[PDB]
Design a protein around this motif. Sequence first.
Motif, PDB file in Angstrom:
ATOM      1  N   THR A   3      -4.012 -13.135   3.379  1.00 43.37           N
ATOM      2  CA  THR A   3      -3.399 -11.819   3.342  1.00 43.37           C
ATOM      3  C   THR A   3      -4.007 -10.918   4.411  1.00 43.37           C
ATOM      4  N   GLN A   4      -3.184 -10.018   4.942  1.00 46.15           N
ATOM      5  CA  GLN A   4      -3.658  -9.080   5.944  1.00 46.15           C
ATOM      6  C   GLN A   4      -4.603  -8.059   5.315  1.00 46.15           C
ATOM      7  N   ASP A   5      -5.443  -7.460   6.163  1.00 47.60           N
ATOM      8  CA  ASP A   5      -6.431  -6.503   5.676  1.00 47.60           C
ATOM      9  C   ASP A   5      -5.763  -5.286   5.045  1.00 47.60           C
ATOM     10  N   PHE A   6      -4.711  -4.771   5.673  1.00 46.08           N
ATOM     11  CA  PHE A   6      -3.978  -3.636   5.136  1.00 46.08           C
ATOM     12  C   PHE A   6      -2.504  -3.776   5.489  1.00 46.08           C
ATOM     13  N   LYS A   7      -1.669  -3.089   4.718  1.00 51.12           N
ATOM     14  CA  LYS A   7      -0.230  -3.140   4.921  1.00 51.12           C
ATOM     15  C   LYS A   7       0.204  -2.148   5.993  1.00 51.12           C
ATOM     16  N   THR A   8       1.254  -2.519   6.720  1.00 56.09           N
ATOM     17  CA  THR A   8       1.803  -1.699   7.787  1.00 56.09           C
ATOM     18  C   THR A   8       3.315  -1.631   7.627  1.00 56.09           C
ATOM     19  N   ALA A   9       3.914  -0.591   8.208  1.00 53.53           N
ATOM     20  CA  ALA A   9       5.361  -0.425   8.119  1.00 53.53           C
ATOM     21  C   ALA A   9       6.094  -1.593   8.766  1.00 53.53           C
ATOM     22  N   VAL A  10       5.588  -2.081   9.901  1.00 58.86           N
ATOM     23  CA  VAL A  10       6.253  -3.182  10.587  1.00 58.86           C
ATOM     24  C   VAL A  10       5.923  -4.518   9.936  1.00 58.86           C
ATOM     25  N   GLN A  11       4.757  -4.635   9.304  1.00 57.79           N
ATOM     26  CA  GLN A  11       4.293  -5.896   8.725  1.00 57.79           C
ATOM     27  C   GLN A  11       3.833  -5.683   7.290  1.00 57.79           C
ATOM     28  N   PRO A  12       4.763  -5.629   6.339  1.00 57.65           N
ATOM     29  CA  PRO A  12       4.369  -5.630   4.926  1.00 57.65           C
ATOM     30  C   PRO A  12       3.994  -7.030   4.468  1.00 57.65           C
ATOM     31  N   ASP A  13       3.026  -7.099   3.553  1.00 53.55           N
ATOM     32  CA  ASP A  13       2.563  -8.377   3.011  1.00 53.55           C
ATOM     33  C   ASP A  13       3.439  -8.776   1.823  1.00 53.55           C
ATOM     34  N   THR A  14       4.687  -9.109   2.137  1.00 60.18           N
ATOM     35  CA  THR A  14       5.631  -9.530   1.115  1.00 60.18           C
ATOM     36  C   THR A  14       5.421 -10.998   0.762  1.00 60.18           C
TER      37      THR A  14
END
Length: 32
Positions: A3-14
């Motif tokens: 999982t990514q460190d934090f969520k971003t508008a362009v890259q959500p951790d769906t």
Amino acid sequence: VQTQDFKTAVQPDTNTAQLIKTYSNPKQRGDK
């Protein structure tokens, strides 16, 4: 798949994205 460190508008951790990442890019580090 890490999982990514934090969520971003362009890259959500769906969950769907992580499922696709199994065969698209299973080696992605996820460290921003």
